[PDB]
Design a protein around this ligand. Structure first.
Ligand code: NAG
Ligand code: NAG
Lengths: 49, 49
């Protein structure tokens, strides 16, 4: 629900984020603060292209 | 998790695969061997087009 569209569930119990994500980028997701819109445009591209 | 993007959950308890899938294609999914990348490009097209 948090990651939203930015990533996909590989199935192996991991989410294959579709965009460059630095350590800070990761940390922002673990607390729950992370926002999808930020990387939305970026991720969306690597997915369907 | 297996089908990944290739298909969609119709809701009626079925997955509407978006690409030509022969009997072998199906069998590969039942054991779990099946790979998404193979039909990724193909399926992706029929979905958003
Ligand atoms: C979540 O991570 C961000 C990093 O951008 C940090 O500023 C914040 O303190 C963290 N929040 C929690 C609950 O740890
Ligand atoms: C899965 O299906 C493939 C068909 O390509 C077949 O080669 C393989 O033996 C099957 N594996 C299992 C576990 O039945």
């Amino acid at each position: 629900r948090q990651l939203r569209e930015n990533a996909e569930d590989m199935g192996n119990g991991c989410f294959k984020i579709y965009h460059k994500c630095d350590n800070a980028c990761i940390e922002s997701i673990r607390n729950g603060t992370y926002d999808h819109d930020v990387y939305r445009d970026e991720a969306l591209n690597n997915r369907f292209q």
